């Protein structure tokens, strides 16, 4: 419902909320919208849950085969696999997917795949129903070559605004940092971003 | 359409875009969406042009009659007239109105009448198709008391973002300031706000 990915200076941070609603009722108050595809190169998905889970499983299997047979996949390879899966089933699935990854050569890459199967790189990406309320703010407060803490603060502010102004979005704020050091998981509770 | 009204220390400030579209075609690019219903009471209209114009004319007539009979109506009175008109004919009208006025209450006053004819009094209000993209921003850059220049800059930034991200909004930015000195009209062209 509120999904984001930003590449600052040393890697990529992907952030999301944790609210899953089956209508006006909250079906899952704390859901993990961040799914691992490989060790690196993994981000969050929006839209229908079943389609996104199936696409994520298929992409994970395909990239496992790619790693076993031809070396190590890049972020663009995962973006292409997602694009093919979304485009060939254009009339069958409604997912919407952002893919974020890290590698030594490029040091952080993001790809956006909306409904219809198109793919765009962009320096930062926002998606979901709540992101509609943060289009201006994210445009007014994004800079290239930021530090990790500044990126965490920017994601926290944007996701807090999205949670506040969207009914179907917002539990806790989950963040994943992918850099050369490794993969780091962060969680921010409502008492933090609401104040 | 993107419309907003914010109260500051010396009064109230109203801002609007100048785009009217029929489907995907821009019928008007110099639209004036700021309507005067009393000397220091103005309204911002969104939705059906005919409904909003008719409601504004009727409210202006009622306020003129009130002035002839009673004196100077308050902004709450104009908001009440708008609410009555919108609520009585909710099934046949599509109009979202923001009523902003400066009077002895000071610091300006803003009322919101969304679809359905409800009334809400807010320090600042946004409306239109382009407001959805500037909600969070306006919640992070608003303060209760601001000067004239700061308020103008805030309006300019908000409407610039709304025009940038909404295809139904565009053109020039028109602003109206209501203070004890009177009424001021400001125009900001695309060569100015497309950067800041």
């Amino acid at each position: 419902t509120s999904i984001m990915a930003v590449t600052f200076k040393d890697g990529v941070i992907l952030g999301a909320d944790s609210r899953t609603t089956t209508g006006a009722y909250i079906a899952n108050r704390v859901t993990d919208k961040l799914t691992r595809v490989h060790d690196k190169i993994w981000c969050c998905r929006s839209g229908s849950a079943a389609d996104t889970q199936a696409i994520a499983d298929i992409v994970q299997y395909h990239l496992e085969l790619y790693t076993s047979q031809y070396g190590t996949p890049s972020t663009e390879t995962a973006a292409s696999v997602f694009k093919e899966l979304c485009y060939e089933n254009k009339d069958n699935l409604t997912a919407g997917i952002i893919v974020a990854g890290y590698d030594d050569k490029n040091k952080g890459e993001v790809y956006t795949i909306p409904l219809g199967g198109s793919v765009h790189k962009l320096p930062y990406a926002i998606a979901g129903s709540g992101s509609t309320f943060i289009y201006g703010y994210c445009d007014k407060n994004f800079r290239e070559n930021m530090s990790k803490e500044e990126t965490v603060d920017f994601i926290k502010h944007s996701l807090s605004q999205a949670i506040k102004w969207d009914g179907s979005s917002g539990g806790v704020i989950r963040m994943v940092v992918l850099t050369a050091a490794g993969v780091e998981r962060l969680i921010f509770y409502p008492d933090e971003y609401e104040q | 359409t993107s419309i907003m009204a914010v109260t500051f220390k010396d009064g109230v400030i109203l801002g609007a875009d100048s785009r009217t579209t029929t489907g995907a075609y821009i019928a008007n690019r110099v639209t004036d969406k700021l309507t005067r219903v009393h000397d220091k009471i103005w309204c911002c209209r969104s939705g059906s042009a005919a409904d909003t114009q008719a409601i504004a004319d009727i409210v202006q007539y009622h306020l003129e009659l009130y002035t002839s009979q009673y004196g100077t109506p308050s902004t709450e009175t104009a908001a009440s007239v708008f609410k009555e008109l919108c609520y009585e004919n909710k099934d046949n009208l599509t109009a979202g109105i923001i009523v902003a006025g400066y009077d002895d209450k000071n610091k300006g006053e803003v009322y919101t009448i969304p679809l359905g004819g409800s009334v809400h009094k807010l320090p600042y209000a946004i409306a239109g198709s382009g407001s959805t993209f500037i909600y969070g921003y306006c919640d992070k850059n608003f303060r209760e008391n601001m000067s004239k220049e700061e308020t103008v800059d805030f309006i300019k930034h908000s409407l610039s973002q709304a025009i940038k991200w909404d295809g139904s909004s565009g053109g020039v930015i028109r602003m109206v300031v209501l203070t004890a000195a009177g009424v001021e009209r400001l125009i900001f062209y695309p060569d100015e706000y497309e950067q800041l």
Binding site: - | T20, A27, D32, S48, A49, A50, Q53, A54
Partner: protein, 221 residues
């Protein structure tokens, strides 16, 4: 169907084409679309022709009665208000889309009125099926300082573009100029670029070709 209005430094100019069709068939090839509301307040209509004619005549009669009652020259704002209130009362069922130009003691005015009852103000306006080509031409070749000749030529060029590029528009061009301080000047068939050209044969039947059963005389006189 293409109607254009352009304001110039000393008044307003309105122009239209002279084609009236029903479906893909051309009914009238010299139809008049410039309707006179008052001697110096004119209007051009698009949409249902009958509705446009009836509403213009009704508003003109009402404004004439008002002018006689008040002993003052009619104002185009009064006509605009009457038209907009009437159309809003009928909620767009009266399919008239009007461009109203005029000159009153308060100056020259140009407005556009839609079926549902919404009005717009501008220095140049276009309405109809060929309105997009006319609007493109107006956007391409307009400036603040326009003489009467420049405004007339711009309106005529917009109408010509609408004629040449829109299938629903064609035939001739009619132009009315208000020109504050002067009488309104009407120019019907200002441009006639669509002659029919001579046919290859004459089709005059010989007398007696048609077989006649009975011939009588009607007492009508």
């Amino acid at each position: 169907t293409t109607i254009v209005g352009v304001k110039f430094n000393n008044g307003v100019v309105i122009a239209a084409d002279t084609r009236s069709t029903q479906g893909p068939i051309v009914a009238d090839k010299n139809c008049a679309k410039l309707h006179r509301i008052s001697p110096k307040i004119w209007c051009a209509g698009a949409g249902t022709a009958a509705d446009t004619e009836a509403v213009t005549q009704l508003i003109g009669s009402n404004i004439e009665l008002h002018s006689l009652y008040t002993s003052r020259e009619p104002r185009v704002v009064s006509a605009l208000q009457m038209l907009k209130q009437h159309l809003f009362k009928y909620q767009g069922h009266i399919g008239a889309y009007l461009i109203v130009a005029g000159v009153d003691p308060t100056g020259s005015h140009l407005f556009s009125i839609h079926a549902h009852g919404s009005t717009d103000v501008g220095y140049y306006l276009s309405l109809g099926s060929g309105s997009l080509a006319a609007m493109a031409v107006l956007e391409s070749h307009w400036k603040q300082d326009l003489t009467k000749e420049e405004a007339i030529k711009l309106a005529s060029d917009a109408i010509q573009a609408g004629i040449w590029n829109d299938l629903g528009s064609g035939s001739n061009v009619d132009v009315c100029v208000m020109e504050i301080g002067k009488d309104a000047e009407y120019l019907r068939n200002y441009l006639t670029p669509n002659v029919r050209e001579e046919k290859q044969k004459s089709y005059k039947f010989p007398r007696g070709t048609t077989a006649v059963l009975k011939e009588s005389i009607v007492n009508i006189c």
